[PDB]
């Protein structure tokens, strides 16, 4: 694994021998591409470069097959041919046939590792918020009070952990009645004694979450989990479900999931305990 290197034809800068087949394997570290450029090219010319040729192979396709004699157009650069590959590995193959009718001094080439800008070089940006490119890689960052997920791609608000054991309580989405945060997963847990059952009540006007898509799928959703039984997912302007839910369980999980865009007022509910 190198950052730069040099590739010279056999016996350069003198003439190359006949019937030779030399190969070089070029490798730069991960997170880099390769800029390969020729500064000298003096090889026997033939149709399709069949006799003598220098070959460039990225992945396993052919980037190019060079032969003939060429000098640079610019006096500001000796580069005659150049290749830019988005891969970290490359192969160069030089071969010559049985005879040279003239003095052919072969070729001279150089390669340098080129940084990949993952934030711009691709169709999609691999970060929910801010993408930070550096040399040899990249990293994602988050706005204040947002934290990076284990996938190191998604940023989300910390709104999980609060366990409710009180027999009566109220629960609301973050910042209610101000808009809820985006790209977040909020988990609320209610734990009562055995003999009691969690019953959730809320007013219909106390629920405003982004509406479902054209296929009825909730992009933002609120769901109640009581073991195997399940209530939801709920979304839309106004609570579409029952305003009074007897969960038949002393333990209830409340999960509020939101995507990247489209936030609304949120929700506010009350729970209490009924006997079994």
């Amino acid at each position: 694994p190198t950052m730069y290197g040099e590739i010279l034809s056999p016996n350069y800068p003198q003439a190359y021998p006949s019937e030779v087949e030399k190969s070089w394997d070029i490798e730069v570290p991960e997170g880099y591409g390769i800029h390969l450029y020729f500064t000298h090219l003096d090889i026997e010319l033939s149709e399709n470069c069949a006799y003598d040729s220098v070959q460039i192979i990225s992945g396993d396709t052919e980037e190019g097959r060079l032969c003939g004699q060429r000098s640079s157009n610019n006096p500001h650069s000796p580069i005659v041919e150049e290749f830019q590959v988005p891969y970290n590995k490359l192969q160069v193959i030089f071969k010559s046939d049985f005879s040279n009718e003239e003095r052919f001094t072969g070729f001279a080439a150089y390669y340098v590792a080129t940084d990949i800008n993952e934030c711009t070089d691709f169709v999609d940006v691999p970060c929910s918020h801010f993408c930070n490119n550096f040399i040899g890689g990249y990293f994602c960052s988050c706005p204040p009070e947002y934290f990076l997920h284990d996938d190191m791609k998604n940023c989300g608000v910390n709104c999980s952990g609060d366990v409710f054991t009180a027999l009566i309580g109220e629960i609301a989405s973050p910042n209610y009645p101000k808009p809820y945060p985006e790209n977040s997963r909020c988990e609320y847990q209610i734990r009562l004694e055995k003999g009691f059952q969690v019953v959730v009540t809320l007013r219909r006007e106390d629920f405003d979450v982004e509406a479902a898509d054209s296929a009825g799928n909730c992009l933002d959703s609120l769901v109640f989990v009581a073991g195997d039984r399940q209530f939801g997912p709920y979304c839309g302007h106004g609570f579409p479900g029952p305003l009074n839910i007897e969960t038949k369980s002393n333990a209830l999980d409340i999960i509020f999931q939101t995507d990247l865009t489209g936030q609304k007022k949120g929700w506010k509910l009350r729970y209490h305990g009924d006997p079994m």
Partner: peptide, 23 residues
């Protein structure tokens, strides 16, 4: 008028010679 085009590619490789003598 403009510069005449670059000369064409070189002709095909000549055929192999005849077989040789025997030491």
């Amino acid at each position: 008028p403009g510069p005449p085009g670059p000369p064409g590619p070189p002709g095909k490789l000549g055929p192999p010679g005849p077989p040789g003598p025997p030491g």
